[PDB]
């Protein structure tokens, strides 16, 4: 289980056709200088920690 | 500089991605794995995720035979076709860097004509 954490730096904005997916930018919390942009399912506020099963996709906005 | 060089020839078309490593000469291929052998879905063959999984498996094989550093040449289909590299080209190139290989002398080698033979569609195009 190579679980890596991260925490939201800036909430970009909603995406998806129904708008149920929030696009956020996260700082990796082990190395600060790495910032990847991914998208989440539930409700996210500013500065809360996430869990990344694999931190490689850097996904774009859905339609 | 005790680095040993190979050449990764990345072919990113819109139907599939080829990650292909030879030595300095183009003979004696080290490892070739495509985007389509990491997913049997037939439509994710050109996906960025299936493209980068190929580059995970290349660098494992280059580590076994002992290639440490890589020149990369990336291309689209080219010819009379699109000239735009597919979506998998970026993901596979980035995945070689994360895997531990070294990279130098990037070049886009897409085949470009000097205005040669006719194209798809016949004057009214692939019309939809």
């Amino acid at each position: 289980t190579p679980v890596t954490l991260a925490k939201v730096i800036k909430v970009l904005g909603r995406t998806g056709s129904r708008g149920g997916v929030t696009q956020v930018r996260v700082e990796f919390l082990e190395d600060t200088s790495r910032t990847i942009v991914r998208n989440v399912k539930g409700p996210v506020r500013e500065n809360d920690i996430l869990v990344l099963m694999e931190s490689e996709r850097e996904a774009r906005r859905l339609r | 500089n005790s680095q040993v060089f190979g050449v990764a020839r990345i072919y990113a078309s819109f139907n599939d991605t080829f990650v292909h490593v030879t030595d300095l000469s183009g003979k004696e291929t080290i490892a070739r794995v495509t985007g389509g052998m990491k997913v049997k879905a037939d439509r994710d063959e050109s996906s960025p995720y299936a493209a980068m999984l190929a580059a995970q498996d290349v660098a494992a094989k280059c580590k076994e035979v002992g290639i440490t550093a890589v020149h990369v040449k990336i291309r689209a289909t080219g010819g009379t076709r699109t000239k735009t590299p597919g979506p998998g080209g970026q993901a596979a190139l980035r995945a070689l860097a994360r895997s531990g290989l070294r990279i130098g002398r990037i070049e886009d080698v897409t085949p470009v004509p000097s205005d040669s033979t006719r194209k798809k569609g016949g004057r009214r195009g692939r019309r939809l």
């Binding site: 790495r34 990847i36 942009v37 850097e58 | 500089n1 680095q3 550093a69 990336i74 699109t82 000239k83 735009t84 590299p85 970026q90 190139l93 980035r94 070689l96 860097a97 994360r98 531990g100 290989l101 070294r102 990279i103 130098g104 002398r105 990037i106 070049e107 886009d108 194209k119 798809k120 569609g121 004057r123 009214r124 195009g125 692939r126 019309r127 939809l128």
Partner: protein
Amino acid sequence: PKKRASNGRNKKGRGHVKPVRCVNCSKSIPKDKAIKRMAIRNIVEAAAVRDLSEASVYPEYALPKTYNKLHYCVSCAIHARIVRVRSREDRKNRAPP
């Protein structure tokens, strides 16, 4: 009635220009028409410039760019939203944004 005084795009003094092919569909469209863009892009994306810096021999050498001129059909450019419809007054504006 007539819709634009250029009838399309700029022939005005020739009689004939040789055609090109669209990149999405490959409809044969004359070169004076056929909306043209120039796509200048770095080979590595903005997320991987940070990534390939540490994995590089020849420190901070350069990044090569992809230079690509794109010819579009009228129908494909409207669909791909590089060009959209505009008002009767705004149609006369020949300036890039």
